[PDB]
Symmetry: none
Subunit: 209 residues, 2 copies
């Protein structure tokens, strides 16, 4: 069913995330649901300059590759999220600049709501997962749990994961996740946040949009 | 009398603001006075990659679109500013790197005049508006009030706004606003400013 048309668009999106510097070289991975199957970046591949030859196809329900190309060593949480979240179509694990700095900090933010776009796009709460070996079962299980009700998670000493309806939403979510972290580091940690009431107020603004 | 030439210039100019990273994705908004009407970026549109289909033509006096494109929320302060400032033709709400860091700071700097370029282009005095919901009447009130006699404004916990007679003046004004903030942060807070006398001398 899936044509080279979808695989070409997947490729350009992977490059687009690489041009935005959401990940460097061989860290991070991407997936995209088309019907009963998903496109996932191949293990050990560079998402910025991605493949074509190293694009894996798996069945979402029994996540074994059908195209005979080995998937991301982290495909378990990619596909897990997709089984879990019927509304989600793209998952991006990346490794941003300031957001990775923060993921490695001993004193992490309790509150990332520094501008309106953060609670609106990234989520009003950002679950933080402790360090697990990349590709470890324990990691997949935590991400899947974290992403049942959240679109954005911080992996400590690793990077971050984001998901959404399409490539643009995922791009938007990734960039603002990065921007929140940039504000926090660059302000020197002495910032103020939106009030709970004020984040609820935004519903009216989101409606109008 | 909006030709496509007007709209194409608006699109190109939106794009150059995006290339400078004055805003990211769907944050910020841009407006341009052309006679009795104004071009405004459409609500929800991404201004760095705008978007012929998402440009609003609005009557300045009334605020209502004529081309089927829903204008930016916050069209209320843009049109507010154009009505009170006949000299102003472009208004940009943006959200750049170091200036937004300053936006969210609990203890803001009180003096931004760190090079000659700041008092010249940005203004010797930058009004700081508290946080109000984007698009809200309270925000419109503050922004319009602050921009009667200033061209540059800091929106707490949000971003910044700039005024100008044209696109070049706005681009420069925004770039130096950001530069002033970049200096403050990179210096680590321990910076000196031009004296009041020295700013008065800049004439």
């Amino acid at each position: 069913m899936i044509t080279d048309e979808h695989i070409e668009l997947f490729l350009a999106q992977a490059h687009r995330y690489g041009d935005a510097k959401l990940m460097l070289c061989s860290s991070g991975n991407l997936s995209w649901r088309i019907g009963e199957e998903a496109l996932i970046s191949g293990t050990g591949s560079w998402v910025p300059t991605l493949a074509k030859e190293k694009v894996s196809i798996c069945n979402i329900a029994s996540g074994t590759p059908t195209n005979g190309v080995k998937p991301s060593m982290e495909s378990t949480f990619h596909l897990g999220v997709l089984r879990e979240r019927p509304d989600v179509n793209v998952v991006l694990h990346f490794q941003s600049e300031y957001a990775t700095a923060i993921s490695c900090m001993k004193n992490k933010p309790t509150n990332f709501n520094v501008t309106a776009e953060i609670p609106c796009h990234v989520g009003s709460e950002i679950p933080v997962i402790p360090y697990y070996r990349p590709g470890s079962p324990e990691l997949a299980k935590a991400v899947v749990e974290a992403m049942l009700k959240h679109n954005s998670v911080l992996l400590t000493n690793h990077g971050q994961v984001v998901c959404g309806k399409d490539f643009d939403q995922v791009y938007e979510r990734a960039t603002f996740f990065e921007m929140a972290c940039r504000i926090i580091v660059q302000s020197g940690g002495d910032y103020s946040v939106l009030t709970p009431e004020e984040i609820e107020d935004l519903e009216i603004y989101v409606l109008g949009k």
